[PDB]
Amino acid sequence: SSFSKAPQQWATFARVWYLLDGKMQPPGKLAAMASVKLQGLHKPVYHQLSDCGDHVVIM
Amino acid sequence: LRSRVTDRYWRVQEVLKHARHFRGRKNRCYRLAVRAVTRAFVKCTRARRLKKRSLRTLWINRITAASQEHGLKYPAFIINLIKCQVELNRKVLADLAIYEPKTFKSLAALAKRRREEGFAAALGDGKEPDGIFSRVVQHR
Amino acid sequence: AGSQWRLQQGFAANPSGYGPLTELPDWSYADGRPAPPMKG
Amino acid sequence: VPKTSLGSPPWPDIVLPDPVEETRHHAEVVGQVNELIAAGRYGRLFAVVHFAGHQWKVTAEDLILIENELDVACGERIRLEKVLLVGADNFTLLGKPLLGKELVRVEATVIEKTESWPKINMKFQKRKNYQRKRITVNPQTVLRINSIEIAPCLC
Amino acid sequence: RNRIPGRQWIGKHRRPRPVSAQAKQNMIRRLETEAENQYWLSR
Amino acid sequence: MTGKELFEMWTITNPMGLLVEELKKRKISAPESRLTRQSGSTTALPVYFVGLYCDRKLIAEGPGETVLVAEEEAARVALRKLFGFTENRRPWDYSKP
Amino acid sequence: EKDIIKMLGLEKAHTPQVHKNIPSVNAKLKVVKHLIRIKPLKLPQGLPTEEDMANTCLKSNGELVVRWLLN
Amino acid sequence: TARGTASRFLTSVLHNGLGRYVQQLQRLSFSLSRDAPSSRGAREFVEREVTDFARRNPGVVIYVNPRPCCVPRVVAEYLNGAVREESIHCKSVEEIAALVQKLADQSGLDVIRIRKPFHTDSPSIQGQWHPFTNKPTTLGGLRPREVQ
Amino acid sequence: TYSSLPDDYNCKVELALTSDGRTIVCYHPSVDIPYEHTKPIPRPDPVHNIEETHDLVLKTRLEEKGEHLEQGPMIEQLSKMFFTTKHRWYPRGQYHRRRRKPNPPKDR
Ligand SMILES: [Mg+2]
Ligand SMILES: [Mg+2]
Ligand SMILES: [Mg+2]
Ligand SMILES: [Mg+2]
């Protein structure tokens, strides 16, 4: 919690890489959660103007 | 007695000061500025009305994000927090989610516990079993 | 929301209805003397 | 016993602890939190309070702006009676829906009694020659939350 | 491609917009409230 | 001092050295640096979480854009925890004695 | 219907109004019964006395309490 | 218009009210006229209740200047060096008193759009959210498709 | 033992109700990452530009790395490296450059 300003900022707004196996999965149900992760709607620090968005890798 | 307007400079400037940051000829020409300034003011009032709705939607989105991060859905979290007589609004809930992660996890655990007690009561249909967190406290 | 639950439990459908959250005064002097009553 | 897809509900089965053991564990947890409060091992406290129709999450040395004028002079201390939530790094106390006055005490000093910037309110109707312009200057107050105290009177 | 002749909601041929379960539930709730009202208005 | 940190006004040069000296004074052998969490390492903007373990017990953890920066931040966090300048510390007492 | 609502004192929505249970007003309530919710007024503690006028309240469930937040 | 004007965050001068409260009004200069009809309210204010205000607020230096001026003015100078000039032209004694009390109560900061109704330093007690604050750790810190 | 949420991610929630029943308390001590759930820090140290004949020239070779590209390929490389689009890196005109606030407000 007692981080400096710049490392705290980096930790809070860091990008995350998620994996998603698409074997025998509906493309729509894959795409809904992939889009949620892409927008960043799973972050409490989310905002439309902020660039909070994580990478999604679908295999 | 001929009367003419002598403060027209200030009359024009009172309108032109609100359009200095515009684009095109609307920041210079008075005819094109009066229409643009009026639209700016109308949009200002409408967006003042809509700012509360936009911020409430943002807070709700952040609460959904945090709750789903804790493995819980937003409607369930809200209704169980209400059933626990915890009257924290969406702004405070989003503030806690962003800045008080342990407190938000505790609130999510309490909401999930209340949901489990409600489900157990509904399944049992028994009056004598009462949940520990399902008790209602009246005004004192 | 939970207006139906509050109605069933007997409270107001709105948390701002005759509840202790609004009926009670929300501030007082640090000396302990009571604050002037609220207009609402 | 057959095991089909719809023969069992699609959620984990939940089992709840027995009420007497739950009450004993609750007593133990309350005692531990109370002993932490008595020892004063909490570092900093934040509190969610209800004031002037809004809920504020404030800590010590905090600043808040209230959109209405109060019946106090500048520099006066005020006890915020409605405290819904208190929290520290280790424990957290919730009200149902409010906490106790003897349990929590929050003090705020009045700093500035001012007025807001001129807000524009204009109504306009198309091709009806209806324009109405108004200026709003809402009085405002500034409060500095100084200290948040908690007492060991926690049963 | 699927044009609606005339206006959407006034002409002889209108838009075939259906009735939803939410609308049915709202009407049922209103009917229950009115039944309670007409019971209380009896004696 | 309200809203200010310790190292913002101290401006030390070797946080890890200062931490190891303080631990030697406090009878601790040495902190071991371990990469706790990370997100992306081949990208241009990585993030690394580096923790310091004393006798396999976590004492501090710090984020950074690189491993060295994360380790330095973890050392600074450990120093702040040791010296009592935590962000959640007791606020200064402003009262009449 | 608008005039009946106006004369019943129900101009403002979601504000309860107390009325008699006589047929004279029951006729108007029947006329506008589709715009109103009607409940019976319950008095667990009796009618409010002259010393309890200023400490009463009307709950959402319909009982008019005589002593509301004493002390 | 917020986009057309300036803005600032909620703040206090020199952490006012933290250790002690210091009144931000430093000096108050009234410029009025002894015979102009527009200065009648200012004259009555000076006759009646400028002394009471001075006694109530000993931390502000009050100057009064009767000079041949057409519009009466009040100049409030604050500890920041901020100067607020108001016109008391053709106002009642009660209006003058209300304006003077408002000037005394104000902090002297610019009256512009305030971005937030609140301001605190270090609001991240017990931590601040980062994407790793609520994710479980795996044995050995292995990646999802990494084989040890 | 019982817990509505798993105690594996950063705090251990223990809920309780006061004897009066009007207060819900909860003890949530933080959780440290165990030593067995971490990996050693990787060290990258390689000086392949060193020369046994002239160390000054060896240092110069490793320090004089330079490269230049056109705007098109440079913006393409930047977009590929930061996972953005090419449109972000193009400049803006005077009308947009001069309307930026010289002294934006700062919080904290
Ligand atoms: Mg409104
Ligand atoms: Mg009102
Ligand atoms: Mg058509
Ligand atoms: Mg038609």
Side-chain angles (χ1 to χ4, degrees), chain A, chain B, chain C, chain D, chain E, chain F, chain G, chain H, chain I residues 1-42 44 46 66-108:
Chain A
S1 168
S2 296
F3 303 153
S4 302
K5 302 295 189 291
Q8 179 76 75
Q9 164 72 23
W10 201 258
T12 296
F13 279 98
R15 300 213 194 120
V16 179
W17 289 63
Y18 294 90
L19 188 64
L20 194 45
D21 201 27
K23 185 190 271 284
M24 299 266 299
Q25 296 295 314
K29 260 153 171 202
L30 286 174
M33 65 180 288
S35 66
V36 162
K37 298 292 178 179
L38 279 188
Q39 307 198 37
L41 297 157
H42 62 285
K43 301 186 167 186
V45 306
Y46 158 79
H47 193 247
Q48 317 175 302
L49 281 193
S50 302
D51 208 2
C52 45
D54 315 301
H55 296 70
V56 175
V57 181
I58 307 184
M59 42 153 68
Chain B
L1 174 70
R2 184 157 186 244
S3 305
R4 307 172 69 186
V5 176
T6 61
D7 64 331
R8 203 167 306 173
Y9 167 79
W10 294 270
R11 295 186 186 181
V12 167
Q13 283 324 310
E14 183 215 20
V15 176
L16 279 190
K17 66 182 181 180
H18 295 297
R20 284 311 181 191
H21 66 284
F22 287 6
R23 184 206 285 255
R25 288 191 281 163
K26 314 185 306 156
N27 50 12
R28 291 161 273 171
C29 310
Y30 182 78
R31 174 181 314 248
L32 318 171
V34 287
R35 312 198 198 107
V37 166
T38 291
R39 299 202 101 247
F41 290 165
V42 173
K43 291 175 205 270
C44 185
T45 76
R46 283 199 330 251
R48 178 183 306 128
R49 194 190 271 298
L50 288 166
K51 172 187 184 178
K52 310 151 176 44
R53 307 194 220 156
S54 297
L55 277 157
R56 189 182 163 111
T57 308
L58 174 67
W59 299 332
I60 285 176
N61 291 341
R62 292 170 160 176
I63 295 165
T64 60
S67 296
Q68 273 284 70
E69 174 190 285
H70 285 302
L72 197 62
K73 286 186 178 180
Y74 170 85
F77 176 76
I78 301 299
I79 64 178
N80 295 291
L81 208 69
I82 301 299
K83 287 166 187 291
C84 294
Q85 307 196 217
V86 187
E87 300 294 336
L88 300 173
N89 52 4
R90 285 126 188 92
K91 175 183 175 189
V92 171
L93 280 183
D95 287 25
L96 295 180
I98 302 173
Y99 289 114
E100 308 306 325
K102 297 179 195 166
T103 304
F104 198 92
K105 177 159 163 191
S106 298
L107 285 173
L110 172 63
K112 191 169 183 177
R113 171 63 184 270
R114 182 51 178 84
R115 202 169 183 247
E116 294 169 346
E117 304 191 345
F119 288 151
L123 192 140
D125 308 76
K127 302 308 293 198
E128 64 274 15
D130 199 294
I132 318 304
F133 293 98
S134 297
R135 293 191 270 252
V136 178
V137 169
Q138 304 295 327
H139 71 291
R140 257 65 163 269
Chain C
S3 89
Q4 288 300 317
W5 177 87
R6 286 192 265 252
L7 289 178
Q8 289 193 269
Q9 298 309 314
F11 311 108
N14 196 21
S16 298
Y18 66 78
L21 201 75
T22 76
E23 293 291 329
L24 307 179
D26 56 20
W27 72 269
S28 71
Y29 288 95
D31 296 329
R33 53 221 181 100
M38 305 204 276
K39 332 285 177 175
Chain D
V1 174
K3 285 204 309 216
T4 54
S5 296
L6 315 173
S8 85
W11 46 70
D13 194 20
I14 193 66
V15 54
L16 279 74
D18 192 74
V20 298
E21 292 181 353
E22 263 290 332
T23 47
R24 288 166 192 159
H25 181 62
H26 290 181
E28 293 179 353
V29 171
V30 165
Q32 201 194 343
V33 174
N34 204 23
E35 78 170 71
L36 294 174
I37 292 170
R41 263 171 274 187
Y42 52 91
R44 186 187 262 257
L45 305 159
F46 73 94
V48 173
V49 301
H50 187 98
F51 186 75
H54 305 273
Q55 303 189 2
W56 313 83
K57 182 247 181 181
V58 300
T59 181
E61 293 179 353
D62 200 334
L63 272 179
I64 55 173
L65 184 69
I66 295 90
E67 311 285 0
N68 54 276
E69 202 57 278
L70 267 57
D71 290 328
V72 293
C74 292
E76 290 266 29
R77 308 192 91 258
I78 276 168
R79 182 193 199 275
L80 312 181
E81 293 180 353
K82 297 176 184 171
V83 185
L84 286 82
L85 168 62
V86 181
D89 214 322
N90 274 47
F91 54 87
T92 299
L93 311 177
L94 277 296
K96 292 181 69 105
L98 285 173
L99 280 188
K101 294 223 301 163
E102 71 273 338
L103 173 58
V104 59
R105 174 161 211 261
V106 183
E107 302 99 354
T109 305
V110 194
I111 293 186
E112 164 192 16
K113 291 174 70 175
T114 183
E115 293 179 353
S116 69
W117 72 303
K119 295 138 164 181
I120 302 299
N121 180 262
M122 182 143 194
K123 314 182 71 133
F124 171 82
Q125 283 254 30
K126 315 171 61 143
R127 64 191 60 90
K128 303 222 321 183
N129 200 36
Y130 174 55
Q131 300 190 6
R132 162 203 157 286
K133 184 152 181 23
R134 199 203 281 200
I135 298 284
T136 302
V137 182
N138 208 16
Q140 300 175 331
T141 315
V142 192
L143 291 192
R144 164 95 65 181
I145 299 95
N146 305 113
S147 83
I148 302 172
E149 289 93 3
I150 59 188
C153 52
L154 202 172
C155 69
Chain E
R1 168 184 157 85
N2 296 115
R3 286 189 55 256
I4 307 166
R7 274 191 76 97
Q8 276 184 117
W9 303 110
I10 67 165
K12 170 204 284 191
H13 309 142
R14 306 181 185 189
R15 185 175 176 180
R17 160 208 194 181
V19 165
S20 297
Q22 219 174 16
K24 298 178 191 181
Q25 285 170 30
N26 299 338
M27 181 145 298
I28 287 175
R29 174 203 319 152
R30 284 192 57 203
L31 286 169
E32 293 175 77
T33 301
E34 189 145 2
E36 183 152 10
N37 280 269
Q38 82 183 18
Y39 162 75
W40 285 124
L41 283 180
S42 282
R43 284 143 59 238
Chain F
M1 297 199 330
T2 300
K4 305 274 272 153
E5 271 197 359
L6 166 64
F7 293 133
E8 280 181 1
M9 41 184 99
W10 198 347
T11 72
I12 62 170
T13 308
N14 203 16
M16 193 53 159
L18 189 42
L19 172 66
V20 76
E21 302 163 1
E22 281 312 306
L23 290 181
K24 204 92 61 173
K25 292 173 69 175
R26 274 150 210 266
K27 255 72 192 161
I28 314 292
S29 47
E32 187 143 19
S33 302
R34 287 295 277 238
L35 189 72
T36 62
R37 302 189 144 281
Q38 58 169 354
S39 181
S41 313
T42 66
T43 48
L45 72 165
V47 63
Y48 301 95
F49 270 76
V50 161
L52 303 173
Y53 291 92
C54 281
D55 268 325
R56 294 171 161 41
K57 294 202 271 273
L58 187 69
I59 62 170
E61 183 178 1
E65 70 255 11
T66 49
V67 181
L68 299 182
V69 172
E71 177 176 347
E72 204 153 85
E73 181 66 11
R76 287 188 194 275
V77 167
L79 270 188
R80 270 186 279 248
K81 280 196 219 213
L82 285 190
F83 296 159
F85 262 64
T86 54
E87 183 178 1
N88 54 67
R89 79 178 182 272
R90 270 270 178 92
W92 204 266
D93 203 48
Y94 295 99
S95 305
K96 47 177 181 69
Chain G
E1 291 181 40
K2 287 191 180 73
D3 293 350
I4 293 289
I5 283 295
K6 184 182 161 323
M7 65 184 73
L8 278 169
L10 301 169
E11 309 191 76
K12 185 157 269 214
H14 299 303
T15 68
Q17 173 84 290
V18 60
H19 273 291
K20 297 170 181 169
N21 203 347
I22 51 186
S24 66
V25 299
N26 277 355
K28 317 190 177 189
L29 293 186
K30 287 170 184 183
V31 165
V32 291
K33 67 182 175 64
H34 52 272
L35 313 166
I36 60 185
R37 172 179 293 120
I38 291 174
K39 293 294 182 174
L41 171 55
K42 307 172 187 175
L43 303 160
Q45 303 141 1
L47 294 174
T49 56
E50 293 294 327
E51 63 267 13
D52 276 328
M53 289 303 180
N55 303 306
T56 187
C57 167
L58 179 73
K59 273 156 93 73
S60 87
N61 52 246
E63 292 82 3
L64 177 83
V65 291
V66 173
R67 316 190 63 172
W68 182 244
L69 277 71
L70 58 92
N71 296 15
Chain H
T1 293
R3 272 175 157 266
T5 71
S7 45
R8 71 174 180 87
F9 285 105
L10 186 64
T11 187
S12 66
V13 183
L14 211 67
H15 302 279
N16 194 354
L18 194 42
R20 63 171 96 202
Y21 166 73
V22 167
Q23 186 173 349
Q24 293 284 300
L25 188 69
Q26 189 180 5
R27 82 189 71 258
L28 205 62
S29 298
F30 300 89
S31 175
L32 74 164
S33 175
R34 69 174 176 87
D35 49 358
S38 44
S39 303
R40 164 201 166 192
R43 294 198 281 277
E44 300 204 344
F45 177 78
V46 166
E47 290 165 16
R48 283 221 269 286
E49 65 183 1
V50 70
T51 48
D52 293 330
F53 179 78
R55 273 141 52 179
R56 282 195 304 263
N57 296 115
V60 59
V61 194
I62 308 179
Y63 303 92
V64 178
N65 306 274
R67 64 181 101 161
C69 76
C70 294
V71 60
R73 297 181 189 280
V74 65
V75 171
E77 306 194 31
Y78 295 88
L79 259 58
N80 286 314
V83 185
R84 209 169 196 262
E85 195 172 350
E86 309 284 345
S87 168
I88 48 184
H89 173 88
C90 289
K91 283 166 176 215
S92 298
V93 190
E94 297 83 2
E95 288 177 328
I96 307 306
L99 171 59
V100 164
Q101 191 60 253
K102 182 200 79 193
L103 288 186
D105 283 318
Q106 273 164 0
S107 174
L109 290 174
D110 288 330
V111 176
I112 51 177
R113 211 277 314 282
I114 303 177
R115 297 207 171 197
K116 291 195 272 262
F118 53 86
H119 165 75
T120 178
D121 283 316
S122 296
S124 64
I125 304 140
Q126 78 199 79
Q128 181 172 318
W129 186 94
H130 53 80
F132 295 117
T133 199
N134 274 317
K135 284 202 211 283
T137 59
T138 182
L139 171 63
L142 295 175
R143 283 173 275 261
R145 286 318 166 99
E146 186 196 28
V147 177
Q148 180 178 0
Chain I
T1 185
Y2 177 79
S3 44
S4 296
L5 305 188
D7 304 333
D8 295 330
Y9 63 95
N10 268 312
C11 80
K12 184 161 304 193
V13 178
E14 292 177 351
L15 290 153
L17 198 68
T18 59
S19 66
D20 206 358
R22 308 197 292 105
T23 292
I24 321 176
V25 305
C26 64
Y27 180 55
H28 43 84
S30 182
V31 173
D32 70 292
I33 315 297
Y35 190 85
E36 299 81 38
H37 283 228
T38 65
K39 43 171 60 163
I41 276 175
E67 188 202 342
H68 191 271
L69 273 180
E70 299 185 318
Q71 184 210 61
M74 177 193 92
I75 287 182
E76 183 206 323
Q77 184 178 2
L78 285 159
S79 57
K80 197 197 182 191
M81 182 179 72
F82 282 119
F83 298 107
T84 73
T85 44
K86 74 168 177 187
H87 310 95
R88 193 261 169 211
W89 312 100
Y90 286 106
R92 294 211 101 91
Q94 310 279 354
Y95 169 73
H96 284 283
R97 273 219 299 285
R98 315 187 97 95
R99 63 185 270 129
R100 295 181 90 265
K101 266 190 286 314
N103 293 125
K106 192 203 183 214
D107 210 7
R108 309 287 155 79

